[PDB]
Protein backbone atom coordinates (compact mmCIF):
# COMPACT_ATOMS: atom_id res chain seq x y z
CA UNK A 1 0.00 0.00 0.00
CA UNK A 2 1.19 3.60 -0.76
CA UNK A 3 -0.13 4.64 2.73
CA UNK A 4 -0.24 2.88 6.12
CA UNK A 5 -2.36 3.80 9.17
CA UNK A 6 -0.06 4.15 12.20
CA UNK A 7 -0.65 5.29 15.82
CA UNK A 8 2.63 6.96 16.96
CA UNK A 9 3.46 7.23 20.66
CA UNK A 10 4.08 10.91 21.60
CA UNK A 11 7.20 11.12 23.84
CA UNK A 12 8.43 13.93 26.15
CA UNK A 13 11.85 15.11 24.79
CA UNK A 14 13.53 14.60 28.23
CA UNK A 15 12.47 10.89 28.29
CA UNK A 16 13.94 10.04 24.87
CA UNK A 17 16.86 7.61 25.20
CA UNK A 18 17.94 7.50 21.52
CA UNK A 19 17.76 11.07 20.27
CA UNK A 20 17.99 10.44 16.50
CA UNK A 21 18.17 7.84 13.75
CA UNK A 22 21.78 8.22 12.50
CA UNK A 23 24.40 10.42 10.95
CA UNK A 24 23.29 11.35 7.38
CA UNK A 25 20.05 12.59 5.77
CA UNK A 26 19.77 9.33 3.77
CA UNK A 27 20.40 7.14 6.89
CA UNK A 28 17.89 8.95 9.14
CA UNK A 29 15.12 8.79 6.47
CA UNK A 30 15.94 5.06 5.92
CA UNK A 31 15.97 4.24 9.66
CA UNK A 32 12.81 6.33 10.35
CA UNK A 33 10.92 4.39 7.64
CA UNK A 34 12.21 1.04 9.00
CA UNK A 35 11.17 1.96 12.63
CA UNK A 36 7.74 3.15 11.33
CA UNK A 37 7.25 -0.26 9.58
CA UNK A 38 8.46 -2.18 12.77
CA UNK A 39 6.27 -0.14 15.23
CA UNK A 40 9.39 1.15 17.03
CA UNK A 41 9.06 4.89 16.14
CA UNK A 42 8.05 7.69 18.53
CA UNK A 43 7.04 11.31 17.90
CA UNK A 44 8.20 14.43 19.83
CA UNK A 45 6.05 17.56 19.45
CA UNK A 46 8.27 20.51 18.44
CA UNK A 47 8.28 23.52 20.81
CA UNK A 48 10.93 26.05 21.91
CA UNK A 49 13.97 24.13 23.23
CA UNK A 50 13.03 20.68 21.82
CA UNK A 51 15.25 20.40 18.68
CA UNK A 52 18.53 21.44 20.41
CA UNK A 53 17.92 18.47 22.82
CA UNK A 54 17.77 16.01 19.85
CA UNK A 55 20.45 14.88 17.37
CA UNK A 56 20.71 16.08 13.76
CA UNK A 57 19.95 15.12 11.11
CA UNK A 58 16.26 15.45 12.21
CA UNK A 59 13.36 13.54 10.60
CA UNK A 60 10.02 15.45 10.66
CA UNK A 61 6.53 14.22 9.87
CA UNK A 62 4.77 16.96 7.87
CA UNK A 63 1.08 17.17 6.84
CA UNK A 64 0.88 16.14 3.12
CA UNK A 65 -2.81 17.12 2.54
CA UNK A 66 -6.06 18.48 4.20
CA UNK A 67 -7.67 13.10 7.24
CA UNK A 68 -9.06 9.58 6.53
CA UNK A 69 -10.49 7.62 9.55
CA UNK A 70 -8.96 10.27 11.95
CA UNK A 71 -5.43 9.67 10.44
CA UNK A 72 -3.66 12.86 9.17
CA UNK A 73 -1.78 12.13 5.91
CA UNK A 74 1.94 12.79 6.51
CA UNK A 75 5.28 12.46 4.77
CA UNK A 76 8.92 12.45 5.96
CA UNK A 77 11.26 15.50 5.57
CA UNK A 78 14.85 15.41 6.97
CA UNK A 79 16.82 18.48 8.10
CA UNK A 80 20.63 18.95 8.49
CA UNK A 81 22.34 22.33 9.27
CA UNK A 82 19.21 24.27 8.26
CA UNK A 83 18.60 22.52 4.90
CA UNK A 84 15.50 20.31 4.40
CA UNK A 85 15.28 17.30 2.07
CA UNK A 86 11.69 17.11 0.97
CA UNK A 87 8.97 19.75 0.72
CA UNK A 88 5.68 19.32 2.66
CA UNK A 89 3.15 20.99 5.02
CA UNK A 90 3.04 21.81 8.76
CA UNK A 91 5.31 19.77 11.13
CA UNK A 92 3.33 17.35 13.42
CA UNK A 93 6.62 16.55 15.22
CA UNK A 94 10.12 15.06 15.05
CA UNK A 95 10.54 11.25 14.82
CA UNK A 96 12.84 9.34 17.20
CA UNK A 97 13.41 5.65 17.95
CA UNK A 98 10.99 4.28 20.56
CA UNK A 99 12.74 1.94 23.04
CA UNK A 100 9.96 1.61 25.69
CA UNK A 101 9.53 5.23 26.89
CA UNK A 102 6.02 5.87 28.29
CA UNK A 103 4.05 8.13 25.92
CA UNK A 104 1.82 11.08 26.89
CA UNK A 105 -0.53 10.56 23.89
CA UNK A 106 -0.87 8.89 20.46
CA UNK A 107 -0.89 10.68 17.06
CA UNK A 108 -2.89 8.76 14.36
CA UNK A 109 -1.21 9.27 10.94
CA UNK A 110 -1.58 7.90 7.41
CA UNK A 111 2.10 7.60 6.36
CA UNK A 112 2.96 8.01 2.66
CA UNK A 113 5.25 4.89 2.38
CSV table of N, CA and C in Angstrom, one decimal:
chain,number,residue,atom,x,y,z
A,1,UNK,N,0.9,-1.2,0.0
A,1,UNK,CA,0.0,0.0,0.0
A,1,UNK,C,0.9,1.3,0.0
A,2,UNK,N,0.5,2.3,-0.7
A,2,UNK,CA,1.2,3.6,-0.8
A,2,UNK,C,1.1,4.3,0.6
A,3,UNK,N,0.1,4.0,1.4
A,3,UNK,CA,-0.1,4.6,2.7
A,3,UNK,C,-0.4,3.6,3.8
A,4,UNK,N,0.0,3.8,5.0
A,4,UNK,CA,-0.2,2.9,6.1
A,4,UNK,C,-0.7,3.7,7.3
A,5,UNK,N,-1.8,3.2,7.9
A,5,UNK,CA,-2.4,3.8,9.2
A,5,UNK,C,-1.4,3.4,10.3
A,6,UNK,N,-0.9,4.4,11.0
A,6,UNK,CA,-0.1,4.2,12.2
A,6,UNK,C,-0.6,5.0,13.3
A,7,UNK,N,-0.4,4.5,14.6
A,7,UNK,CA,-0.6,5.3,15.8
A,7,UNK,C,0.7,5.5,16.5
A,8,UNK,N,1.2,6.7,16.5
A,8,UNK,CA,2.6,7.0,17.0
A,8,UNK,C,2.6,7.4,18.4
A,9,UNK,N,3.4,6.8,19.3
A,9,UNK,CA,3.5,7.2,20.7
A,9,UNK,C,4.2,8.6,20.7
A,10,UNK,N,3.5,9.5,21.4
A,10,UNK,CA,4.1,10.9,21.6
A,10,UNK,C,4.9,10.9,22.9
A,11,UNK,N,6.2,11.2,22.7
A,11,UNK,CA,7.2,11.1,23.8
A,11,UNK,C,7.6,12.5,24.3
A,12,UNK,N,7.8,12.7,25.6
A,12,UNK,CA,8.4,13.9,26.2
A,12,UNK,C,9.9,13.9,25.8
A,13,UNK,N,10.4,15.0,25.3
A,13,UNK,CA,11.8,15.1,24.8
A,13,UNK,C,12.8,14.7,25.9
A,14,UNK,N,12.6,15.0,27.2
A,14,UNK,CA,13.5,14.6,28.2
A,14,UNK,C,13.5,13.1,28.6
A,15,UNK,N,12.5,12.4,28.1
A,15,UNK,CA,12.5,10.9,28.3
A,15,UNK,C,13.2,10.2,27.2
A,16,UNK,N,13.4,10.8,26.0
A,16,UNK,CA,13.9,10.0,24.9
A,16,UNK,C,15.4,9.5,25.1
A,17,UNK,N,15.5,8.2,25.0
A,17,UNK,CA,16.9,7.6,25.2
A,17,UNK,C,17.7,7.7,23.9
A,18,UNK,N,17.1,7.5,22.8
A,18,UNK,CA,17.9,7.5,21.5
A,18,UNK,C,17.5,8.7,20.7
A,19,UNK,N,18.3,9.7,20.6
A,19,UNK,CA,17.8,11.1,20.3
A,19,UNK,C,17.9,11.3,18.8
A,20,UNK,N,18.1,10.3,18.0
A,20,UNK,CA,18.0,10.4,16.5
A,20,UNK,C,18.2,9.1,15.9
A,21,UNK,N,18.2,9.1,14.5
A,21,UNK,CA,18.2,7.8,13.8
A,21,UNK,C,19.5,7.6,13.1
A,22,UNK,N,20.5,8.4,13.2
A,22,UNK,CA,21.8,8.2,12.5
A,22,UNK,C,22.4,9.5,12.0
A,23,UNK,N,23.3,9.4,11.1
A,23,UNK,CA,24.4,10.4,10.9
A,23,UNK,C,24.3,11.1,9.6
A,24,UNK,N,23.4,10.8,8.7
A,24,UNK,CA,23.3,11.3,7.4
A,24,UNK,C,21.8,11.5,7.1
A,25,UNK,N,21.5,12.4,6.2
A,25,UNK,CA,20.1,12.6,5.8
A,25,UNK,C,19.5,11.3,5.3
A,26,UNK,N,20.3,10.6,4.4
A,26,UNK,CA,19.8,9.3,3.8
A,26,UNK,C,19.6,8.3,4.9
A,27,UNK,N,20.5,8.2,5.8
A,27,UNK,CA,20.4,7.1,6.9
A,27,UNK,C,19.2,7.4,7.8
A,28,UNK,N,19.0,8.6,8.2
A,28,UNK,CA,17.9,9.0,9.1
A,28,UNK,C,16.5,8.7,8.5
A,29,UNK,N,16.4,9.1,7.2
A,29,UNK,CA,15.1,8.8,6.5
A,29,UNK,C,14.9,7.3,6.3
A,30,UNK,N,16.0,6.5,6.0
A,30,UNK,CA,15.9,5.1,5.9
A,30,UNK,C,15.5,4.4,7.2
A,31,UNK,N,16.2,4.8,8.3
A,31,UNK,CA,16.0,4.2,9.7
A,31,UNK,C,14.6,4.6,10.2
A,32,UNK,N,14.2,5.9,9.9
A,32,UNK,CA,12.8,6.3,10.4
A,32,UNK,C,11.8,5.4,9.7
A,33,UNK,N,11.9,5.2,8.4
A,33,UNK,CA,10.9,4.4,7.6
A,33,UNK,C,10.9,3.0,8.2
A,34,UNK,N,12.1,2.4,8.4
A,34,UNK,CA,12.2,1.0,9.0
A,34,UNK,C,11.5,1.0,10.4
A,35,UNK,N,11.8,1.9,11.3
A,35,UNK,CA,11.2,2.0,12.6
A,35,UNK,C,9.7,2.2,12.5
A,36,UNK,N,9.2,3.0,11.6
A,36,UNK,CA,7.7,3.2,11.3
A,36,UNK,C,7.1,1.8,10.9
A,37,UNK,N,7.8,1.1,10.0
A,37,UNK,CA,7.2,-0.3,9.6
A,37,UNK,C,7.2,-1.2,10.8
A,38,UNK,N,8.3,-1.2,11.7
A,38,UNK,CA,8.5,-2.2,12.8
A,38,UNK,C,7.7,-1.8,14.0
A,39,UNK,N,7.0,-0.6,14.1
A,39,UNK,CA,6.3,-0.1,15.2
A,39,UNK,C,7.2,0.3,16.4
A,40,UNK,N,8.4,0.8,16.0
A,40,UNK,CA,9.4,1.1,17.0
A,40,UNK,C,9.8,2.6,16.8
A,41,UNK,N,8.8,3.5,16.4
A,41,UNK,CA,9.1,4.9,16.1
A,41,UNK,C,8.2,5.7,17.1
A,42,UNK,N,8.8,6.7,17.7
A,42,UNK,CA,8.0,7.7,18.5
A,42,UNK,C,8.0,9.1,17.9
A,43,UNK,N,7.2,10.0,18.4
A,43,UNK,CA,7.0,11.3,17.9
A,43,UNK,C,7.2,12.3,19.1
A,44,UNK,N,8.0,13.3,18.9
A,44,UNK,CA,8.2,14.4,19.8
A,44,UNK,C,7.6,15.7,19.2
A,45,UNK,N,6.7,16.3,19.9
A,45,UNK,CA,6.0,17.6,19.4
A,45,UNK,C,7.1,18.7,19.6
A,46,UNK,N,7.2,19.5,18.5
A,46,UNK,CA,8.3,20.5,18.4
A,46,UNK,C,7.7,21.8,19.2
A,47,UNK,N,8.5,22.2,20.2
A,47,UNK,CA,8.3,23.5,20.8
A,47,UNK,C,9.7,24.1,21.1
A,48,UNK,N,9.7,25.3,21.5
A,48,UNK,CA,10.9,26.0,21.9
A,48,UNK,C,11.7,25.1,22.8
A,49,UNK,N,13.0,24.9,22.4
A,49,UNK,CA,14.0,24.1,23.2
A,49,UNK,C,14.0,22.7,22.9
A,50,UNK,N,13.1,22.1,22.1
A,50,UNK,CA,13.0,20.7,21.8
A,50,UNK,C,14.2,20.3,20.9
A,51,UNK,N,14.3,20.9,19.7
A,51,UNK,CA,15.2,20.4,18.7
A,51,UNK,C,16.7,20.4,19.2
A,52,UNK,N,17.2,21.5,19.9
A,52,UNK,CA,18.5,21.4,20.4
A,52,UNK,C,18.8,20.3,21.4
A,53,UNK,N,17.8,19.6,21.9
A,53,UNK,CA,17.9,18.5,22.8
A,53,UNK,C,17.9,17.2,22.0
A,54,UNK,N,17.7,17.2,20.7
A,54,UNK,CA,17.8,16.0,19.8
A,54,UNK,C,19.0,16.1,18.9
A,55,UNK,N,19.2,15.0,18.2
A,55,UNK,CA,20.4,14.9,17.4
A,55,UNK,C,20.1,15.1,15.9
A,56,UNK,N,20.8,16.0,15.2
A,56,UNK,CA,20.7,16.1,13.8
A,56,UNK,C,21.5,15.0,13.1
A,57,UNK,N,21.1,14.6,11.8
A,57,UNK,CA,19.9,15.1,11.1
A,57,UNK,C,18.6,14.7,11.8
A,58,UNK,N,17.6,15.6,11.7
A,58,UNK,CA,16.3,15.5,12.2
A,58,UNK,C,15.4,14.8,11.1
A,59,UNK,N,14.4,14.0,11.5
A,59,UNK,CA,13.4,13.5,10.6
A,59,UNK,C,12.0,14.1,11.1
A,60,UNK,N,11.4,14.9,10.3
A,60,UNK,CA,10.0,15.5,10.7
A,60,UNK,C,8.9,14.6,10.0
A,61,UNK,N,7.8,14.5,10.6
A,61,UNK,CA,6.5,14.2,9.9
A,61,UNK,C,5.8,15.5,9.6
A,62,UNK,N,5.4,15.7,8.4
A,62,UNK,CA,4.8,17.0,7.9
A,62,UNK,C,3.4,16.6,7.2
A,63,UNK,N,2.4,17.4,7.4
A,63,UNK,CA,1.1,17.2,6.8
A,63,UNK,C,1.2,17.3,5.3
A,64,UNK,N,0.7,16.3,4.6
A,64,UNK,CA,0.9,16.1,3.1
A,64,UNK,C,-0.4,16.6,2.4
A,65,UNK,N,-1.5,16.9,3.1
A,65,UNK,CA,-2.8,17.1,2.5
A,65,UNK,C,-3.8,17.5,3.7
A,66,UNK,N,-4.9,18.1,3.3
A,66,UNK,CA,-6.1,18.5,4.2
A,66,UNK,C,-7.3,17.6,3.9
A,67,UNK,N,-8.2,13.9,6.1
A,67,UNK,CA,-7.7,13.1,7.2
A,67,UNK,C,-8.5,11.8,7.4
A,68,UNK,N,-8.3,10.8,6.5
A,68,UNK,CA,-9.1,9.6,6.5
A,68,UNK,C,-9.1,8.8,7.9
A,69,UNK,N,-10.3,8.5,8.4
A,69,UNK,CA,-10.5,7.6,9.5
A,69,UNK,C,-9.9,8.2,10.8
A,70,UNK,N,-9.6,9.6,10.8
A,70,UNK,CA,-9.0,10.3,11.9
A,70,UNK,C,-7.4,10.3,11.8
A,71,UNK,N,-6.9,9.7,10.7
A,71,UNK,CA,-5.4,9.7,10.4
A,71,UNK,C,-5.0,10.8,9.5
A,72,UNK,N,-4.2,11.7,10.0
A,72,UNK,CA,-3.7,12.9,9.2
A,72,UNK,C,-2.7,12.3,8.2
A,73,UNK,N,-2.8,12.6,6.9
A,73,UNK,CA,-1.8,12.1,5.9
A,73,UNK,C,-0.5,12.9,6.1
A,74,UNK,N,0.6,12.2,6.2
A,74,UNK,CA,1.9,12.8,6.5
A,74,UNK,C,3.0,12.2,5.6
A,75,UNK,N,4.0,13.0,5.4
A,75,UNK,CA,5.3,12.5,4.8
A,75,UNK,C,6.5,12.9,5.6
A,76,UNK,N,7.6,12.2,5.3
A,76,UNK,CA,8.9,12.5,6.0
A,76,UNK,C,9.7,13.5,5.2
A,77,UNK,N,10.3,14.5,6.0
A,77,UNK,CA,11.3,15.5,5.6
A,77,UNK,C,12.4,15.5,6.6
A,78,UNK,N,13.6,15.4,6.1
A,78,UNK,CA,14.8,15.4,7.0
A,78,UNK,C,15.4,16.8,6.9
A,79,UNK,N,16.2,17.2,8.0
A,79,UNK,CA,16.8,18.5,8.1
A,79,UNK,C,18.2,18.3,8.6
A,80,UNK,N,19.2,19.0,8.0
A,80,UNK,CA,20.6,19.0,8.5
A,80,UNK,C,21.2,20.3,8.2
A,81,UNK,N,21.7,21.0,9.3
A,81,UNK,CA,22.3,22.3,9.3
A,81,UNK,C,21.5,23.3,8.4
A,82,UNK,N,20.2,23.3,8.7
A,82,UNK,CA,19.2,24.3,8.3
A,82,UNK,C,18.7,24.0,6.9
A,83,UNK,N,19.1,22.9,6.3
A,83,UNK,CA,18.6,22.5,4.9
A,83,UNK,C,17.7,21.3,5.0
A,84,UNK,N,16.5,21.4,4.4
A,84,UNK,CA,15.5,20.3,4.4
A,84,UNK,C,15.5,19.6,3.1
A,85,UNK,N,15.2,18.3,3.2
A,85,UNK,CA,15.3,17.3,2.1
A,85,UNK,C,13.9,16.7,2.0
A,86,UNK,N,13.1,17.2,1.0
A,86,UNK,CA,11.7,17.1,1.0
A,86,UNK,C,11.0,18.5,1.1
A,87,UNK,N,9.8,18.5,0.7
A,87,UNK,CA,9.0,19.8,0.7
A,87,UNK,C,7.6,19.3,1.1
A,88,UNK,N,7.0,19.8,2.2
A,88,UNK,CA,5.7,19.3,2.7
A,88,UNK,C,5.0,20.4,3.5
A,89,UNK,N,3.9,20.0,4.2
A,89,UNK,CA,3.2,21.0,5.0
A,89,UNK,C,3.7,21.1,6.4
A,90,UNK,N,2.8,21.5,7.3
A,90,UNK,CA,3.0,21.8,8.8
A,90,UNK,C,3.7,20.6,9.4
A,91,UNK,N,4.7,20.8,10.3
A,91,UNK,CA,5.3,19.8,11.1
A,91,UNK,C,4.3,19.3,12.2
A,92,UNK,N,4.1,18.0,12.3
A,92,UNK,CA,3.3,17.3,13.4
A,92,UNK,C,4.3,17.0,14.5
A,93,UNK,N,5.6,16.7,14.2
A,93,UNK,CA,6.6,16.5,15.2
A,93,UNK,C,7.9,16.0,14.6
A,94,UNK,N,8.8,15.6,15.5
A,94,UNK,CA,10.1,15.1,15.1
A,94,UNK,C,10.1,13.6,15.5
A,95,UNK,N,10.5,12.7,14.6
A,95,UNK,CA,10.5,11.3,14.8
A,95,UNK,C,11.8,10.9,15.6
A,96,UNK,N,11.7,9.9,16.5
A,96,UNK,CA,12.8,9.3,17.2
A,96,UNK,C,12.6,7.8,17.3
A,97,UNK,N,13.6,7.0,17.5
A,97,UNK,CA,13.4,5.7,17.9
A,97,UNK,C,12.6,5.6,19.2
A,98,UNK,N,11.7,4.6,19.3
A,98,UNK,CA,11.0,4.3,20.6
A,98,UNK,C,11.6,3.0,21.1
A,99,UNK,N,12.1,3.1,22.4
A,99,UNK,CA,12.7,1.9,23.0
A,99,UNK,C,12.1,1.7,24.4
A,100,UNK,N,10.8,1.9,24.5
A,100,UNK,CA,10.0,1.6,25.7
A,100,UNK,C,9.6,2.8,26.6
A,101,UNK,N,10.0,4.0,26.2
A,101,UNK,CA,9.5,5.2,26.9
A,101,UNK,C,8.0,5.3,27.0
A,102,UNK,N,7.5,5.7,28.1
A,102,UNK,CA,6.0,5.9,28.3
A,102,UNK,C,5.5,7.1,27.6
A,103,UNK,N,4.6,7.0,26.6
A,103,UNK,CA,4.0,8.1,25.9
A,103,UNK,C,3.1,9.0,26.8
A,104,UNK,N,2.9,10.2,26.3
A,104,UNK,CA,1.8,11.1,26.9
A,104,UNK,C,0.5,11.0,26.1
A,105,UNK,N,0.6,10.5,24.8
A,105,UNK,CA,-0.5,10.6,23.9
A,105,UNK,C,-0.1,9.7,22.7
A,106,UNK,N,-1.1,9.5,21.8
A,106,UNK,CA,-0.9,8.9,20.5
A,106,UNK,C,-1.3,9.9,19.4
A,107,UNK,N,-0.6,9.8,18.3
A,107,UNK,CA,-0.9,10.7,17.1
A,107,UNK,C,-1.2,9.7,15.9
A,108,UNK,N,-2.4,9.6,15.5
A,108,UNK,CA,-2.9,8.8,14.4
A,108,UNK,C,-2.5,9.4,13.1
A,109,UNK,N,-1.7,8.7,12.3
A,109,UNK,CA,-1.2,9.3,10.9
A,109,UNK,C,-1.5,8.2,9.9
A,110,UNK,N,-1.6,8.7,8.6
A,110,UNK,CA,-1.6,7.9,7.4
A,110,UNK,C,-0.3,8.2,6.7
A,111,UNK,N,0.7,7.3,6.8
A,111,UNK,CA,2.1,7.6,6.4
A,111,UNK,C,2.2,7.3,4.9
A,112,UNK,N,2.5,8.3,4.1
A,112,UNK,CA,3.0,8.0,2.7
A,112,UNK,C,4.3,7.2,2.7
A,113,UNK,N,4.2,5.9,2.3
A,113,UNK,CA,5.3,4.9,2.4
A,113,UNK,C,5.8,4.6,1.0
